[PDB]
Amino acid sequence: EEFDCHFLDEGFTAKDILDQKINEVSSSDDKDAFYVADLGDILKKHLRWLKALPRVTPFYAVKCNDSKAIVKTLAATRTGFDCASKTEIQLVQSLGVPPERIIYANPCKQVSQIKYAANNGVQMMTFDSEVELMKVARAHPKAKLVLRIATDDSKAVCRLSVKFGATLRTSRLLLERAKELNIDVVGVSFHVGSGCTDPETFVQAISDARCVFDMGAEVGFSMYLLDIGGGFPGSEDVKLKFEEITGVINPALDKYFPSDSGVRIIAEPGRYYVASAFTLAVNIIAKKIVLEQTFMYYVNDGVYGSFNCILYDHAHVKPLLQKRPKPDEKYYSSSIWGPTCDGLDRIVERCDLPEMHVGDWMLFENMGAYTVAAASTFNGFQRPTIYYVMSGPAWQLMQQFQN
Amino acid sequence: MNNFNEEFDCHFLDEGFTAKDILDQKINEVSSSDDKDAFYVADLGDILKKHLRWLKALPRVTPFYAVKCNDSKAIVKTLAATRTGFDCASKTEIQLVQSLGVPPERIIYANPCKQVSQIKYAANNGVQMMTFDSEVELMKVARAHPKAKLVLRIATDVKFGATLRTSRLLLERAKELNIDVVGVSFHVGSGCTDPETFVQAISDARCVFDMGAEVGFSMYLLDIGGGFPGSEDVKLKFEEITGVINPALDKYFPSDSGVRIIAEPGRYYVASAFTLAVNIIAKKIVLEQTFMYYVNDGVYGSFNCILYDHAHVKPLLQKRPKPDEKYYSSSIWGPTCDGLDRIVERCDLPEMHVGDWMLFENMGAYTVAAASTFNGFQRPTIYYVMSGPAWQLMQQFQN
Numbered sequence A: 001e002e003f004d005c006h007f008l009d010e011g012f013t014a015k016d017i018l019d020q021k022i023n024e025v026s027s028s029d030d031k032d033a034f035y036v037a038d039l040g041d042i043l044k045k046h047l048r049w050l051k052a053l054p055r056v057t058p059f060y061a062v063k064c065n066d067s068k069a070i071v072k073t074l075a076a077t078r079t080g081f082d083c084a085s086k087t088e089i090q091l092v093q094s095l096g097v098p099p100e101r102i103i104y105a106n107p108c109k110q111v112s113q114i115k116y117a118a119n120n121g122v123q124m125m126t127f128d129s130e131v132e133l134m135k136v137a138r139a140h141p142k143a144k145l146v147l148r149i150a151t152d153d154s155k156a157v158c159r160l161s162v163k164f165g166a167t168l169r170t171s172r173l174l175l176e177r178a179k180e181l182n183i184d185v186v187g188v189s190f191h192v193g194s195g196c197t198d199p200e201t202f203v204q205a206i207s208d209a210r211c212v213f214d215m216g217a218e219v220g221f222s223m224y225l226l227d228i229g230g231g232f233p234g235s236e237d238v239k240l241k242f243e244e245i246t247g248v249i250n251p252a253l254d255k256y257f258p259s260d261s262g263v264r265i266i267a268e269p270g271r272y273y274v275a276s277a278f279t280l281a282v283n284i285i286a287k288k289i290v291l292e293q294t295f296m297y298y299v300n301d302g303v304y305g306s307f308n309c310i311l312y313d314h315a316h317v318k319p320l321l322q323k324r325p326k327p328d329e330k331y332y333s334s335s336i337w338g339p340t341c342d343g344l345d346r347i348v349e350r351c352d353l354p355e356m357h358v359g360d361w362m363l364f365e366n367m368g369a370y371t372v373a374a375a376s377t378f379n380g381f382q383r384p385t386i387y388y389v390m391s392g393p394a395w396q397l398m399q400q401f402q403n
Numbered sequence B: 001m002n003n004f005n006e007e008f009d010c011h012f013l014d015e016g017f018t019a020k021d022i023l024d025q026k027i028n029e030v031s032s033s034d035d036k037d038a039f040y041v042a043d044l045g046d047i048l049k050k051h052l053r054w055l056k057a058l059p060r061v062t063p064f065y066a067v068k069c070n071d072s073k074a075i076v077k078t079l080a081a082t083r084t085g086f087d088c089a090s091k092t093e094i095q096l097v098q099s100l101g102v103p104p105e106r107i108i109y110a111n112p113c114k115q116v117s118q119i120k121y122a123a124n125n126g127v128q129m130m131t132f133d134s135e136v137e138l139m140k141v142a143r144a145h146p147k148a149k150l151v152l153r154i155a156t157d158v159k160f161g162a163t164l165r166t167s168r169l170l171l172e173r174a175k176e177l178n179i180d181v182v183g184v185s186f187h188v189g190s191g192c193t194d195p196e197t198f199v200q201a202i203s204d205a206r207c208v209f210d211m212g213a214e215v216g217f218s219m220y221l222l223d224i225g226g227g228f229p230g231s232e233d234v235k236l237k238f239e240e241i242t243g244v245i246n247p248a249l250d251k252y253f254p255s256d257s258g259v260r261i262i263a264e265p266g267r268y269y270v271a272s273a274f275t276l277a278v279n280i281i282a283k284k285i286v287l288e289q290t291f292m293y294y295v296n297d298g299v300y301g302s303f304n305c306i307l308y309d310h311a312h313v314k315p316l317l318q319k320r321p322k323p324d325e326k327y328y329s330s331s332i333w334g335p336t337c338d339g340l341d342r343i344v345e346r347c348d349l350p351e352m353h354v355g356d357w358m359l360f361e362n363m364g365a366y367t368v369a370a371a372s373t374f375n376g377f378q379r380p381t382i383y384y385v386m387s388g389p390a391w392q393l394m395q396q397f398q399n
């Protein structure tokens, strides 16, 4: 099923296909959870990116969803790939992507994985520490390094301990140390992150990046690479939409990194490409009534599976009814639980739903990003099957991108 | 040492050597190379020691290992030879146990809320005993496994467990549907602070047994669940808990009644058998002087137990530091690019360097069982060891 893609007929949408599949299994007990993944939605996102950020080459953040179908579609589109590990580089290269379309954007890499990157021709890597420079000097001395700078997220849960990113002061010392070690630093990267309430944050990051560029010029480096990271929204169900962010980014790029300077601007979008492409259908496998009347529903995907995103990715999930609800239907306070025997495997603490029954389906939209990528087989429950769909016109568009 | 697939490969543990010595040897073996991937040493002899200890502490209670805690084939094979039962929650777990040769009468399907197709799989493969705590579950059993032997799971002091009031209604409803209810199960859970909770649970089970007798059921199976500690690094130790359980079992379920008592320990068997070695792969100094260490296992891997299992992890050095060695405030981070992939927020450590190893004891339970390959990082290699005397002990259990 990984390389199996189904046709999407004219006048149909991923939703219609989902409804059809649900109807077809209605008289049986084959009601495992499943995804419908519209590869055409990923192509749509790419067109939208090219239009909104014409100066920025997208490098898809593989970690967000490492589906071979996704990577193949994006590779056909000629986008780059941001890989954090040997396995991700192997996946991308296996599909035929040359090394110059890969950035190894992990600032803290095990020596053997740096060696793997060097052996396979991946030259560009990020870094934010002196020890990383020592490791690169030993294991990949001809690498092209991108300095990752810190970006403030005022809504992070742990604002004192920041995992990645050098301050400006540290950035100066790092550039000088790289010069001492005869290591080439070619640019600057930053990552604002998905939790971004104000687009001005991007402006600040771009300004800081320009500062580090100036620092590089002072130390004698030829810096050309600006990496504006990820965090762009992957669906319209957000307060701060993609186009508002890009409307604030493009003037900043024009001001701090004009095209005549020779800068090459890239980004590392992950969730932007894939979030809305996946819709998850789970089946209600068990039910309890608690006395006014409240309900507990048990479904066959949970926090150890697709909904790990609730804990790892700070996700909030909205259950949707497969069968439309009449205006007069009574809604009851309800909780939704995963299949595992763990008391913590709870998807929704409280929501309002009409009375549902075992065998009914619940749908979760925008489930592409940081869901299957982090699922486990805890308690022996297997990952939901993914059905990849693509229309004829979407395939034609992909062909155009291939030429 | 090198694995000859790790699943079924077991290494000998020589006389006078312990799991720690094997760990040191492996570390020494790779000291001059860059192959510094995280790895486990799993002492199957420790699991056999736990079984002997269980037999002595709870002589009336047959243990059914909770496979979900650690589904290692090596573990299940060792426990299967030991003749324990298995508590299975899904088709895959039942498949694993049966593949190793365990007959269905040594399997309890102790998931109260089962998908119909999973119930069907159990019926197809002869697993008759299942738990339940709801009327809807009874409806599903009547359709998909009508000859099952049902065990009523009762609540103890949100997700599972019927109240006594609900238990009465469930027993009557099961009688209406001609479904056989043979016993009661409860699960106190690991975070139990007061052992008296077990006494109340056993008393509640006795009440539900009496309720079953009133409606005409022959109740014989008492399942006291799990939650027993898997290490000595706990406030409430195993033997204190069993000291409170055994008098209650004698009072509420005397042997002459014909009751069969089982338990579902998971972490008790496996927690202390696994020691994890991770390598420091990156390092930062933050200016008095504090350090950030990055290791090659994290919250998406073995340390998912921090979020899923409320685990508190203690990093250990390979060699005990000198008393006057300088310690620094330090943080420990996982390998993934996620900002949340942090193992230790703050601890005191001597200055360490890239290539040094950090050890984590009592990492057997709810660690590898829930690890993912997020960001492409592979699950740590597990090296299984067993001494000759441990193998001899396993033979005695088997015969």
Ligand SMILES: *Cc1c(COP(=O)(O)O)cnc(C)c1O
Pocket: A061, A063, A064, A082, A105, A191, A193, A194, A229, A230, A231, A232, A268, A269, A270, A271, A272, A369, B337, B338
């Ligand atoms: C996670 C990550 C991304 C992708 O983030 P999204 O929110 O999915 O766009 C991009 N760059 C880096 C360095 C990351 O760690």
Ligand SMILES: *Cc1c(COP(=O)(O)O)cnc(C)c1O
Pocket: A341, A342, B066, B068, B069, B087, B110, B187, B189, B190, B225, B226, B227, B228, B264, B265, B266, B267, B268, B365
């Ligand atoms: C998880 C579980 C167990 C095992 O719990 P431990 O804390 O590992 O002993 C036993 N019984 C049931 C019903 C469980 O869900």
